[model samples]
Target: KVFGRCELAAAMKRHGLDNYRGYSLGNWVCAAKFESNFNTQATNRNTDGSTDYGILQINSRWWCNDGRTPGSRNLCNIPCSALLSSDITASVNCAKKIVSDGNGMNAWVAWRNRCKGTDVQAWIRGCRL
Candidate 1:
């Protein structure tokens, strides 16, 4: 239920996430489109019982805890609900931390599947800071 594109870029820029993990701002915004369509309440449960959350679709296996899934490393130090809520701050921070582990944008499978080797300029076309 978000406006998508320009708004996502603005929000991430407002939070000082431009070029995070050495990836283009376009990559982050485009990845968000494929991952959750810029949804804050987005969730997708995997066959392994793990789930993805928020705009980034962060995995539940290690990033957050929903109590249903145990042994979460809780790397984000925040509940999974935080990611589900209508806020991108926690999600962006957690995702950045994950990329900082040397994983880069490859940490997000969605980027590999959709944004990688694609027309990223088209993804952010007409969007401005």
Candidate 2:
């Protein structure tokens, strides 16, 4: 699913991403915009042979088990395949874990380079939450 900007916001909110751990819903929405453009099927291969999966582009190297990433911690205890589905529950769950971890939103370079410290509210403008 390629979620509309506000539609993704609603979905994310339903999963408790709104203001989760001091990060606003806009923060997550903005990160998704830069990371995968809200596409559930999106995947990016890293130089390390691991891949990023799903709307949030959760990494297979540490978050999810892809059965290919060497030494993957599978810290989120989810299969990477689950991240690619139109249903984003697993993706959001893993995202939460990443944020709740020491790295927080810093785990995603896309967010850091593009969304961090910006006027993130622009990502959710007019969204009713």
lDDT of each: 0.83, 0.92
Total clashing pairs for each candidate: 0, 0
Q: Candidate 1, clashing residue pairs?
A: none
- Which candidate leads the pack in lDDT? 2
Model 2: per-residue Cα lDDT over 1-129, one tens digit each: 999999999999999999998999999999999999889999999999999999999888898998999987799998999999988899988888899888789888989999889999999999887
Residues 16-126, candidate 1: write the lDDT tens digits.
677776777788888889999988889999878888888999888888877777665778888888987666889888888888987688888989988988887676678
TM-score of each: 0.92, 0.97
